[PDB]
Amino acid sequence: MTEYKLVVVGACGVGKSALTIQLIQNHFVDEDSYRKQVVIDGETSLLDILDTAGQEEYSAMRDQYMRTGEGFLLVFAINNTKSFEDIHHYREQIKRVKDSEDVPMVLVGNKSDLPSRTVDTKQAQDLARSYGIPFIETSAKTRQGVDDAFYTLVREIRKHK
Ligand SMILES: Nc1nc2c(ncn2[C@@H]2O[C@H](COP(=O)(O)OP(=O)(O)O)[C@@H](O)[C@H]2O)c(=O)[nH]1
């Protein structure tokens, strides 16, 4: 059976855990590791997912997951300008550890249900275009875009392989 090791990166509080919980456990209420078998485009695969902001106690496990991670969600929140500004740092860190320029990634703008917005959709679209990766707007609360974000990433991993 095909396994995909996924890593969800981004600033603290952007909703990495919430997105992963919604995907895996199908709920939201207002664990950093998750493991579930799903079916994506008719292919069964086990998703092994780590949520990380880079500042956790288990750095050794982080570096491992970064090296073995096959695909990365780069998550910011639409109401957190700093988290959007942090994205370039995260992508640069991934490129460094993978020692590669072609790493599957998706840019995720979370908390799309909230009326406070400080990051324009255009800004995020423009950034994703520059990186050559998809941008997906999500809400862990409403489930908007959640499957699409993770499944698009899995599709990016297949394209890479
Ligand atoms: N309204 C709303 N709140 C969210 C969303 N995603 C996460 N949250 C809330 O944002 C806070 C931080 O989420 P969390 O998953 O712990 O962020 P993490 O540090 O990136 O893992 C929590 O209070 C969540 O309930 C979302 O899409 N919409």
Q: Give the pair of three-digit tokens for residue 4.
A: 């995909």
CA distance 106 to 127: 11
Q: Which fold has domain 1-161?
A: Rossmann fold (3.40.50)
Give the count of beta carbons closer than 10 Å to the beta carbon of residue 96: 10
Q: Which residue's CA is minimally distant from atom 14 of ligand 1?
A: 15
Give the Cα-Cα-Cα angle 114, 120, 122 (nearest 5 degrees): 135
Half-sphere exposure of 11 (CA within 13 A, CB side): 18
> Ligand 1 pocket, 109 CB below 6 A?
no
Residue 78 Cβ inside 6 Å of ligand 1? The answer reads no
In three state form, how does the secondary structure of the chain look? CEEEEEEEEECCCCCHHHHHHHHHHCCCCCCCEEEEEEEECCEEEEEEEEEECCCCCCHHHHHHHHHHCCEEEEEEECCCHHHHHCHHHHHHHHHHHHCCCCCCEEEEEECCCCCCCCCCHHHHHHHHHHHCCCEEECCCCCCCCHHHHHHHHHHHHHHHC
Output the residue whose Cα is nearest ligand 1's atom 26: 111
Rounded-to-integer distance, Cα 19 and Cα 156, Å: 19
Answer whether 63's CB lies under 8 Å from 98's CB: no
13 lines ligand 1 (CB under 6 A): yes
Mutate to test the pocket of ligand 1, among 14, 76, 87 (most ligand atoms within 8 A of CB): 14
Strand 33-40: give its sheet, edge to edge.
33-40, 43-52, 2-10, 71-77, 105-110, 135-137
Give the C-alpha separation, 86 to 107, whole Å.
Answer: 12
4/25 Cα distance (integer angstroms): 18
Q: What is d(CA 151, CA 93) in angstroms, rounded to the nearest whole number?
A: 23
Written as one letter, the residue type at 1 is M
Within 10 A of 144 (CB to CB), how many other CB atoms are there?
A: 17
